[PDB]
Amino acid sequence: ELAVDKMVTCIAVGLPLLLISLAFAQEISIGTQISCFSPSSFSWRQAAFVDSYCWAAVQQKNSLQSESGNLPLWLHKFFPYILLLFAILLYLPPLFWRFAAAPHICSDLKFIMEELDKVYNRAIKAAKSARDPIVEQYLKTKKNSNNLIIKYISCRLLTLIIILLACIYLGYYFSLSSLSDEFVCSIKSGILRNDSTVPDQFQCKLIAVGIFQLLSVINLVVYVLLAPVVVYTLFVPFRQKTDVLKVYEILPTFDVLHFKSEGYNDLSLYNLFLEENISEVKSYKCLKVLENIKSSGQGIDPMLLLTNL
Template identity: 50%
Template sequence: MYVDSYCWAAVQKQHLTDAHDTALPLWLHKFFPYILLLVAVCAYTPALFWHLAVAPPLYSDITFILQEFDQSYNRAINLATRLASSHSDTHGSVLDLTDSWFKYPLVEQYLLTKRGSRVLLLRYVLCRLLTLLVLLMAILYLSYYIRLSAQTDEFACSIRTGILQNSSDVPAAFPCKLVAVGIFQLLSLINVCVYGVLMPACVYALLVPLRQSQDFLSPFQLLPTLEVMTFEPAWDDLSLFLLLLEANIYQLKSYKCLKVLEMLKRRNEECDIMVVLQNLGQVKSDITDGKRPAAMATASNHRCNTTEMKELSPLLSSAAGDAVRQRVI
C-alpha cells in the first residue's frame, strides 16, 4: 500500500525522457476523471444559462400566446352561437354583435414585435456555439489522451527516501504500471463516439431557426376572430417563437378540433365553418347544462343536511355536544 501510494504521488513528477518520445506527462492519467467531470460541467453550463436566464420569460410569452389562441377558438364558437340565435334581429344588430366579438389582434401584433429583434436569437446562438466549442475541445483532449495511453502506462519509481535512502535491501527503482489506464482509454473511446454524435446534433440545433415554418397556424386561419398570419422567413426572434409554438401548440385541445375542421374543409370546400362551430357550441352548452342539475342537486342535499343538523342541535345536551365535538376532532 505504501509503494502504491508513493508511486501515485510520483506520477505527477514523471516525464518521458527518451529522445524518441514527446515528453507526455503521466500525471494526466491521475487527473483524467476530474478532467472528464470538468468537461461535463462546461458542457452543461450553456444549458444552465438558458434555463435560468432565458427560459422563464420565454415560457411566460409562449403560455400567453397559446392562451390567446385557445381564447380565439372559444370566441369563434360563441360568435357562431350568437349569430345563430340572432337571425330574427335586424341586419344592424348582427353587425354590432360580430363587431363585439372581434378583438384587437393581440397575438399577431405581439409576434410582429419580434420581427427584426435578435436578442433572444443571439443568446440561443451563443449557447449553441459554447456547447459546440466544449464538445470540440473535449474530443481533442480525449484523442490526445488516447494517444498518450497507447504509448505508455509504465514508469520506474524509486522509493529510496528517508530511512530507506541507504538501505541495500530496497531496489533502486520499482517498475510501476497504471492499471486504470486501460479503463480510462475505453472511457475515452466511448466519450469520443458520443461527443462525435452530439456535434452534428448541436450544429443542427444552431441552424434550426433558419427553418421557419408557419404551416401549423393554418387551422387557426379558419376562425373569423383571428387574422391571417403570414410572416416572411428571416433569422430573428420570430423564427424562434414560431419553432417553440410549433412544438407546444399540440397541447391545446382547440388545435386538435381545428385540425379536424381543416380536414373537413379540404374534403368539402362547400363546408360552412360557422355551421360546424354552431354545432360545437350547442354540444358545449348541452354538456354545461348537464352538469348544472347535478351541481344543483348536490347543493340542495347539502342544504337539507345542514337544516337537519340545525334542527337536531337543540336536542343535544351540553355533555353530548362535547362528546360529539371530541369525536369530530
C-alpha cells in the same frame, strides 16, 4: 426544453457520468490504480510505500522517467476528474437556459396560448350569435428582437464548443502509446537518496488505463455523433416548419397572416416552441381537426366550427 435539446443534454451529461461509473465501479477495477513491483526483499509496507510514492510522483517530474513523457502520466490521473468536468460544463448551458431563457419564453408562450384561446372563443361566439390582432402584432414584434433567441443559440453554441473540446481531448486520450503507465519511478529523494538497500528505480504501471481509453473512444464516438445534432439544433430557422398559426387563419376574429419565417430572430425560436407546446392548446386542436377535414373539402369551415361547438 425542446425534446432534441433535452436528449442532447441527457446524453452529453449522463454519458461521461455513466462512463466514469463504469471504470469507477470497484467490481470493474482489479484493485489499485498503480502497481510498482518492488523487489522480493521489500516488505509489504515497503512495497506499499513504493506504490503510493510513485502514484504521488507522477507529478514530480524529477522522480519518474517515462519514454512518452510526464504529460501522459498526468493525463491518467486527470481523466476521472476530467470527464466529470466535461459533464459539469455540458450541464451548465442547459442550467443557464432553464434558469434564465425559459422564464422569458415561458411567459410569452403562455400569453400567446391564452390569447389564441381567447380569439378562438370570440370567433365562435361571433359565429354562434350569427347562427342565432394583438397576438399577431406581438409576434410581429418578436421578429424585431433576436435577443430572446440569442440566449438559446448562445447556450447551444457553448454546448457545441464544449462538446468539440471534449471530442478533441477524448481523441488525444483515445490514442496513447499506453507505455506511459510502464514508466519507471525512483524513490530516492530525501534521506533515501544515498540509501543502498532500496533499488535505483522501480517499474511501475498505471492500473485501469486501457479501460479509460476504451471508454474515451466510446465517449468520442457518441460526442461526434451528437455534435451534428447540436449544429442542426444550432440553426433555429431551418427547423421552423409546418406553420402552426396557419390553422388559425380560418377564423374571422383572426387576421389572415402567418408572417412567421425566414430569420435569425426570436420569431423563429418562438415558432419552434409554439410548434412544440401548441398541442396543449385546445383551440389549436379543434382548428387542426377542421383543417384536416378541409382536405376533403366536403363542408365549410365556419359551419363545422359552429357545428363543432
